[PDB]
From a paper:
We present here the crystal structure of a full-length RipA homologue from Corynebacterium glutamicum, Cg1735, which reveals an unusual mode of autoinhibition. In this model, two septal TM proteins, Cg1603, with a cytoplasmic N-terminal globular core, and Cg1604, with a C-terminal globular core exposed to the cell envelope, form a signaling complex that couples intracellular cell division events with PG hydrolysis during the last stages of cell separation.
The full periplasmic region of Cg1735 (residues 20 to 600) was crystallized in two different crystal forms with a high (80 to 85%) solvent content. Both structures reveal a tight complex between the C-terminal NlpC/P60 CD (residues 460 to 600) and an anti-parallel two-helical coiled-coil domain (CC1, residues 46 to 238) corresponding to the highly conserved N-terminal region in the RipA family. In the orthorhombic crystal form, the long interconnecting linker (residues 239 to 372) is present but disordered in the crystal. Instead, crystal contacts in the trigonal form promote a disorder-to-order transition in this region that extends the short HL helix into a full anti-parallel two-helical coiled-coil domain, CC2 (residues 243 to 386). The presence of this new structural element precludes complex formation between the CD and the CC1 domain to occur within the same monomer. Instead, the CD–CC1 complex now forms between two different monomers in the asymmetric unit. Analytical ultracentrifugation experiments at different protein concentrations showed that full-length RipA behaves as a monomer in solution, with no trace of dimer formation even at 5 mg/mL, the highest tested concentration, demonstrating that dimerization is due to crystallization-induced domain-swapping effects. The CC2 domain is deeply engaged in—and stabilized by—crystal packing contacts in the trigonal space group. The structure of trigonal Cg1735 soaked in Cl4K2Pt was determined by SAD phasing: two major and several minor Pt sites in the asymmetric unit were found with SHELXD, and the experimental phases obtained with PHASER were significantly improved by density modification with PARROT from the CCP4 suite, as the crystal has a high (85%) solvent content.
Numbering used by the authors: 41 to 125, 146 to 309, 315 to 412, 460 to 494, 509 to 600
The structure:
Amino acid sequence: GEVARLAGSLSSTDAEINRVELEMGALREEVNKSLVDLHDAQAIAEQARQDALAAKKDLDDSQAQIEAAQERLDEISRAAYRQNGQTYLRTSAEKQQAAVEELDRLRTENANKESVLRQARIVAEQREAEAVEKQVQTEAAIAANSEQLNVLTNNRSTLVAQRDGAERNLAIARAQADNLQGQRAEYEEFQQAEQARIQAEAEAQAAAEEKRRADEAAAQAAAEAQEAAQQAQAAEEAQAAQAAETAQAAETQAAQAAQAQAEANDRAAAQQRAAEAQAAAEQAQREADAQAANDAQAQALREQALTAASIAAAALIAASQSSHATTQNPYPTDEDADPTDIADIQGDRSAQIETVIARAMSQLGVQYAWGGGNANGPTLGIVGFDCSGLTLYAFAGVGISLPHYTGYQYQHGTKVSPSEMQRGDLIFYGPGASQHVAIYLGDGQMIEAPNSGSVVKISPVRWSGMTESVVRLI
């Protein structure tokens, strides 16, 4: 059975599909960026313009402000002349000087504002030009990226062509494997993979226990090494302390020297014992990580064999039932032979549910094909899956054989009230499950193959048209 060659080439052309999809993404977003840049340069330009306008507004206010004060000086002189035909003469002379010096003020303020307008106008000139440039820039960047994208999508359509053909061949392979080797053939292969699953699972369980205990051993040897090294450290202390004190002081002389010898002896003794315990901790750590490496390696083989077992379970079921896609009788016509004959399909738990669900999610994106799907995967319509076809596919992974009809799937398992549904349950719609089926995924979302034109997708649970009960198979 050369499934695995096409399965591999399929999956590698799907790897190429996603290369090109991210590449297209990079270009598409490139345009999005310089679109952002353009709209912000435009906002900069319009803001520099409203700054220039603000400048002319106060410059004109300064104009007519100065002219209002000039005309008050004017009416002051007019009053003076008419009043030329004593305390008040003094204070009105002082008022006129106040007005003249105020006008001096407003004068130099207006010159400053004239320079402010010169610069606000130049700033708007500049950043308007900046926006003209960046505008044409991104129109041209769009031209380039639209053309390059059109290239990418030509490549993408040929890749998906290849992909549809390869999937179509994989369906051929699954059929030849299970439709060909009759029941007892897949039965033997299945019993083999189920046995290898239980054994490699037990083996991995043993490598995990020993890795845990070797890790405990690494810990004990490491701590003992550290203790012995600390006693070596205290020897260093007490030796330099003895050294300093004898440096700072006949028979008394021999007593000092003997204590120095005893100090050095204790030091090298605790030091050698520290070196020994630390090389021992190093061995214990090399063993603890050789054993952690084997625990990981054996756990990989454990779930590898667990998976190969689940698919061989799906294959037994597939070889157990007729093609639920054609009509031509796949049985003999003259009473002159004797075939295999297919089973009859018409009217812990947590780990089990997750295996089924992985199978349905693995088909996310597969196109709809009326009547498509079996225990081995998608099939040609009357390639893809239809709603009740997908559920049939998923539960065969845990050896649950379902009919390729919603109304009949509703008769299997246990009828739970819709309000207590949980992950793994079958949600049905239509009277007596005559219209549609989906798998509850938990957390108020479900996976389904819904209607013509929709790929296998995850959608929120729908309450309109729901049957009165859900069905729980595991």
